[PDB]
Symmetry: C2
Subunit: 243 residues, 2 copies
C-alpha cells in the first residue's frame, strides 16, 4: 500500500536508549511511513491494545450496556492502585483495567470472541489460550501495520459491529484534544511472553486529514512506558503533523 | 434546586476589568453555584451557542448526513478567514462558521425549527425573526441556567432526537482533553443587538463526576474574547474542579 522508510526517526529511539518501530499512515494520501519496514510487519501479543476490539464486542453483544454502566471492584487489592475501585468503560480504558476486561471476555465466551475476531480480520485471528487472558499470554498476534488496518476500519465505522458500538469505543479511546489536534489511542504492555514490548496505537485527527499510527518498542522494565507516547509524538512533530 | 452564590469569583472578572456571570452545576450533588444569581437567570441571544441545538436538529432530520459531510464554501469572502473554505460538522463547530449553520436553518425550515426547540424546552422557545438569523438578531433568548438545563439533557441523551444525533454533536463539542479532564463546550459572541456579550457553555467530565457550566460576560470589543474561557477556567481552578 506503498510504503516509505524513514530511518531518521531512529534518533528519537537512540536518544532514549530504546529500540522499536513507529508506523504512520496518511489517510488522505493512502501512503505509509515507518522507520523499520520489517518490524512494522512483525506480529506481537496486543496486550491492552486488545481493549479496543474487546470493548467493541462487549458493546455489540450487550455485555456492556453503555459507557456509564458501572463495573464494581471485585474486592481484590492488585498492584496497580487505580484498578482497586469501581469503573465504567471510559475509566476502565483510561486506566487500562485488565480485570474489568477479563470479566467481559468470560461473558462474551470463546465462540463469539473467535467469530468476532475473524469478522474483524484482527491480526492472526487466533484466540488459543485462556479465554480471559489470550491477548496477554495466548496465541493472538498482531503487527503494527495490522493495527493500522483495523483502526482505519473502526475510524470509518466499517467493522462488523453496530455503528453505535464503534462510536462509543472511539469516545472511550479519547486521549488528548486541543486546538491543533485530537488523539484517539490505546496503550499496551506485553510482559508475560518474550519479547517484552510496549505499544501505542491510534490516530491523530486534524482539520483536513487523519494520520493513523501504531508503534511498539522494547520494554525490559516498566520505567520506560512513557517513552511509547514520547517517541511517537516526537516523530509526529518531526513530520509536522502536530506542532 | 439548591443554589449558592459565591461573590469571591467576582475577583476573576475585576482582575480582567470585566463583568459577567459564571454558573456551575455539580451533577452528582445536584447543586448549583454562581457569582451572580440575578445575571445567572438573565436571558440573552444565544448567538453561536445555538450551534448545539441547530446541529442536533439538522442531524436528526437528515439535513446533515454525518460529521464527514462536506459543506462547500459559497464563494463569499467573509471577514473571518477560517470561514472562507469547505467545512464539515467538526470544523464548522470548531471555527464557529455561521453561514454553514444559516444554511442548515433554511433547510430545517420555520415549522420544524419551532417544533424542535419546543421539544428541547430551549430558552424561551421563540424563533421570531428570520429563519436563518433569529438566534443572532431575532426573538430567542436563553439564560445561563437554562443553557445548563439544556446541556444536561444532551449529556444524558434525553433530548427528543436520536441517540446518534446526540452522540455526534457531543463529539463535535470536544474542546479539550488530557489525563485529568475532558471539556465539551461551545463559544458564542452576540453583537447584532445590545448588549454585546460573549458566551461559553458546556461541561467538564471527570473520572467520577460531571460539572456543567455556562458563562456570559460583557464584550464591547472582540479583544476580550479569550476571557470567556480564561475566566471560567480560573473559577474551575479555584473550585478545585480541574487541577
Ligand atoms: Ca527527539
Ligand atoms: Ca486473516
Ligand atoms: Ca483570577
Ligand atoms: Cl485488558
Ligand atoms: Cl451560528
Ligand atoms: Cl430531564
Ligand atoms: Cl469524543
Amino acid at each position: 500500500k506503498e510504503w516509505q522508510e524513514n530511518k531518521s526517526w531512529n534518533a528519537h529511539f537512540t536518544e532514549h536508549k530504546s529500540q522499536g518501530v513507529v508506523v504512520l499512515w496518511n489517510e488522505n494520501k493512502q501512503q505509509g511511513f515507518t522507520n523499520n519496514l520489517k518490524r512494522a510487519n512483525q506480529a506481537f501479543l496486543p496486550a491492552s491494545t486488545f481493549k479496543i476490539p474487546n470493548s467493541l464486542i462487549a458493546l455489540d453483544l450487550g455485555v456492556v450496556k453503555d459507557e456509564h454502566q458501572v463495573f464494581k471492584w471485585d474486592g481484590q487489592t492488585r498492584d496497580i492502585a487505580t484498578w482497586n475501585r469501581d469503573h465504567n468503560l471510559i475509566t476502565a480504558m483510561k486506566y487500562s483495567v485488565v480485570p474489568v476486561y477479563q470479566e467481559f471476555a468470560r461473558q462474551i465466551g470463546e465462540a463469539r470472541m473467535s467469530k468476532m475476531l475473524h469478522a474483524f480480520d484482527y491480526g492472526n485471528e487466533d484466540i488459543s489460550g485462556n479465554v480471559d487472558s489470550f491477548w496477554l499470554d495466548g496465541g493472538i498476534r498482531i503487527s503494527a501495520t495490522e493495527q493500522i488496518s483495523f483502526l482505519r476500519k473502526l475510524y470509518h465505522n466499517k467493522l462488523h459491529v453496530s455503528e453505535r458500538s464503534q462510536r462509543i469505543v472511539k469516545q472511550a479511546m479519547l486521549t488528548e484534544a486541543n486546538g491543533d489536534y485530537i488523539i484517539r489511542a490505546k496503550t499496551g504492555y506485553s510482559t508475560r511472553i518474550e519479547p517484552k514490548i510496549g505499544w501505542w496505537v491510534g490516530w491523530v485527527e486534524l482539520d483536513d486529514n487523519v494520520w493513523f499510527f501504531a508503534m511498539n518498542m522494547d520494554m525490559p522494565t516498566s520505567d520506560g512506558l512513557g517513552l511509547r507516547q514520547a517517541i511517537t509524538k516526537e516523530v509526529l512533530k518531526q513530520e509536522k503533523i502536530i506542532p
